[PDB]
Amino acid sequence: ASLVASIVEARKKRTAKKNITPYQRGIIRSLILTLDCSEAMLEKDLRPNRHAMIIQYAIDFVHEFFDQNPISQMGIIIMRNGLAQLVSQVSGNPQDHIDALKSIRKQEPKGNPSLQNALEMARGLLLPVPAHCTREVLIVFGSLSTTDPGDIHQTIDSLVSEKIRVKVLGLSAQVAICKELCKATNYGDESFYKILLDETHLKELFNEAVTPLPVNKINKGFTLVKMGFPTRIFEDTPTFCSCHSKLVYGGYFCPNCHSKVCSLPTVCPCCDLMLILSTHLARSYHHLMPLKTFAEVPTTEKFRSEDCFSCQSRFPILTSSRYRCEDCKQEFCVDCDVFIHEILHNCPGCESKPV
Amino acid sequence: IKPVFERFSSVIITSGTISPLDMYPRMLNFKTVLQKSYAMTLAKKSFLPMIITKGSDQVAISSRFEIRNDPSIVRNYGSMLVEFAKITPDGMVVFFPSYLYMESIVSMWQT
Amino acid sequence: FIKGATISYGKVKLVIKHNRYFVETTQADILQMLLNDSVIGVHSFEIANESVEVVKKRCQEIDYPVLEEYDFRNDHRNPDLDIDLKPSTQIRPYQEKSLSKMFGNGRARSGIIVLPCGAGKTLVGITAACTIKKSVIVLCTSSVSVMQWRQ
Ligand SMILES: [Zn+2]
Ligand SMILES: [Zn+2]
Ligand SMILES: [Zn+2]
Ligand SMILES: [Zn+2]
Numbered sequence: 001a002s003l004v005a006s007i008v009e010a011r012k013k014r015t016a017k018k019n020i021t022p023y024q025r026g027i028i029r030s031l032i033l034t035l036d037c038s039e040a041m042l043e044k045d046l047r048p049n050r051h052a053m054i055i056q057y058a059i060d061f062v063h064e065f066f067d068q069n070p071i072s073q074m075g076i077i078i079m080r081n082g083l084a085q086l087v088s089q090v091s092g093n094p095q096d097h098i099d100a101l102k103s104i105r106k107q108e109p110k111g112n113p114s115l116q117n118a119l120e121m122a123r124g125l126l127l128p129v130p131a132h133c134t135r136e137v138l139i140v141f142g143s144l145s146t147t148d149p150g151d152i153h154q155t156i157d158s159l160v161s162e163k164i165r166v167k168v169l170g171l172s173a174q175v176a177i178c179k180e181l182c183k184a185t186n187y188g189d190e191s192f193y194k195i196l197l198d199e200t201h202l203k204e205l206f207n208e209a210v211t212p213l214p215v216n217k218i219n220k221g222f223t224l225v226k227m228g229f230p231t232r233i234f235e236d237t238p239t240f241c242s243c244h245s246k247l248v249y250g251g252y253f254c255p256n257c258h259s260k261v262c263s264l265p266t267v268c269p270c271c272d273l274m275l276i277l278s279t280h281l282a283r284s285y286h287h288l289m290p291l292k293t294f295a296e297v298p299t300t301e302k303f304r305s306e307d308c309f310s311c312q313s314r315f316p317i318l319t320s321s322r323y324r325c326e327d328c329k330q331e332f333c334v335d336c337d338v339f340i341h342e343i344l345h346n347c348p349g350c351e352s353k354p355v
Numbered sequence: 356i357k358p359v360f361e362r363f364s365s366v367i368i369t370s371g372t373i374s375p376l377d378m379y380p381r382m383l384n385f386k387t388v389l390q391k392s393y394a395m396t397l398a399k400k401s402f403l404p405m406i407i408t409k410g411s412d413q414v415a416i417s418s419r420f421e422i423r424n425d426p427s428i429v430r431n432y433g434s435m436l437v438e439f440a441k442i443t444p445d446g447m448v449v450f451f452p453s454y455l456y457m458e459s460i461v462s463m464w465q466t
Numbered sequence: 467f468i469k470g471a472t473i474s475y476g477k478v479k480l481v482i483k484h485n486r487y488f489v490e491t492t493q494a495d496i497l498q499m500l501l502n503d504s505v506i507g508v509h510s511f512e513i514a515n516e517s518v519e520v521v522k523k524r525c526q527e528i529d530y531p532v533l534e535e536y537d538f539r540n541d542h543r544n545p546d547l548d549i550d551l552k553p554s555t556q557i558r559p560y561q562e563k564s565l566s567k568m569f570g571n572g573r574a575r576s577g578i579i580v581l582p583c584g585a586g587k588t589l590v591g592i593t594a595a596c597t598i599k600k601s602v603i604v605l606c607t608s609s610v611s612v613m614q615w616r617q
Contacts, residue, residue, distance in 0.1 A: 413556075
């Protein structure tokens with residue numbers, strides 16, 4: 001009954017994932033990572049520490065976000081001891097955020113939360129943010145209480161006016177205030193306020209949270225952006241960079257002012273334009289067109305092939321692990337189907353199928 | 356309620372946690388043509404009742420009017436109070452049989 | 467080895483009828499095997515009460531072991547010492563198991579318990595006395611330790 005339970009749990013997961021839709025999602029993103037050094041995360045119920053796995057899993061999320069969404073920029077606000085602090089603003093450089101993260105790892109967490117203060121300076125940080133740059137904040141919380149210098153509802157309405165969507169990730173259980181926050185922040189949706197159950201589910205929550213979010217019609221931002229690629233030149237001399245003014249062997253040229261910069265994806269510092277490459281924009285085409293799930297055929301029918309169409313391994317008999325792409329009508333094994341849906345972004349069976 | 360009975364035929368009686376039913380036609384000289392009870396056909400249980408007869412120290416607990424001022428059992432009770440105070444997300448209520456006894460225990464607790 | 471480790475349990479029983487060791491048996495069936503041994507001197511008889519210590523060894527080689535499992539509640543003659551404890555004391559589960567060792571039947575099985583130092587062995591003995599509830603005395607070859615366990 002183990003395979004039957006696995007099949008019915010996969011059916012529940014498939015019922016959750018039936019809504020495969022090509023929604024327009026948040027691409028030009030601006031993120032704020034609200035963190036807390038409070039005394040609640042000192043508890044050794046988590047091994048070695050709540051703050052410990054917060055540190056490593058935050059580093060992992062930084063890497064995953066800079067990979068999956070390179071063109072976006074993310075900031076870090078730290079809560080500690082009655083007043084929140086800023087350690088990393090929004091940047092295309094993950095190195096600064098990583099150095100701040102390991103500085104927080106070196107230091108000790110202690111304090112008590114002021115979520116109104118955190119939200120207020122987060123509002124100040126997202127204040128000079130362009131309209132196409134979507135404003136989103138991630139929230140972690142290890143407690144059940146927060147004192148604040150003033151009322152929170154004016155802040156709530158003001159941030160709703162600032163057109164923001166926010167996910168909140170609590171530690172213990174659901175809190176009505178945070179539920180209301182995600183509700184009003186996310187147009188009545190309360191799927192944005194989720195609580196973990198263990199570290200595996202926690203990491204799964206991170207892996208979900210790296211992904212972009214679909215956007216609505218009513219908050220329409222249909223416009224154009226003035227983009228331009230730089231030209232990398234492998235130069236023969238140590239040369240000054242525009243930003244840090246240090247001598248570099250080679251690098252890029254600005255498409256307009258011909259200045260050089262250390263890294264991509266970054267804006268120009270001089271004529272002030274976003275300079276990316278084709279990798280950054282190609283990174284989300286699998287968002288732009290998704291990959292619909294593959295038809296797991298039953299063992300009752302006769303099959304076109306009894307071995308895998310892709311990895312070329314023989315199919316088993318009690319259950320039929322022959323998973324057929326509807327866009328290609330070729331059955332594949334569970335291993336290849338899971339790997340293609342998690343990594344790959346084209347069906348070789350559909351490459352075989354002529355159109 | 357007797358003039359209510361002889362004044363109105365369609366006298367219909369309901370409540371939430373009236374269990375059992377039989378002593379109410381005893382305490383009130385009446386009868387019903389029919390009476391039963393209803394329990395919900397809920398999907399999964401979301402109210403969680405359990406009976407605690409002992410603290411984490413495994414000490415028997417009671418609120419009798421004689422042993423109400425027993426400081427060891429008081430300390431056990433406040434250990435429970437501490438442990439729900441650490442974990443309460445939104446709201447939590449405690450009742451006692453007698454308000455004087457509440458004021459006594461809360462007075463010495465604050466003390 | 468286990469099969470040969472089968473004894474005449476419940477078959478020999480010494481009772482102290484007010485400082486008088488009456489060595490009963492549960493049946494006259496035990497008496498026929500016992501009379502084969504002649505070191506000595508339902509059915510009891512005269513034994514030198516100091517010689518009981520040696521004839522317990524003797525019955526260990528002749529494999530009919532006596533048991534000591536006190537029916538204090540059925541011994542109404544000895545005055546009970548009904549003394550309890552406070553609820554603030556906490557018995558650890560190994561102490562609870564130790565209390566279950568001589569109380570598999572509720573009759574006070576006599577034996578040996580050795581525990582590590584500082585394990586509240588005094589408290590375990592106090593609990594054992596408070597559940598035995600009869601006249602009882604405490605012995606130890608010292609003075610300062612004895613008065614401090616009195617304390
Ligand atoms: Zn530079
Ligand atoms: Zn430029
Ligand atoms: Zn395969
Ligand atoms: Zn296909």
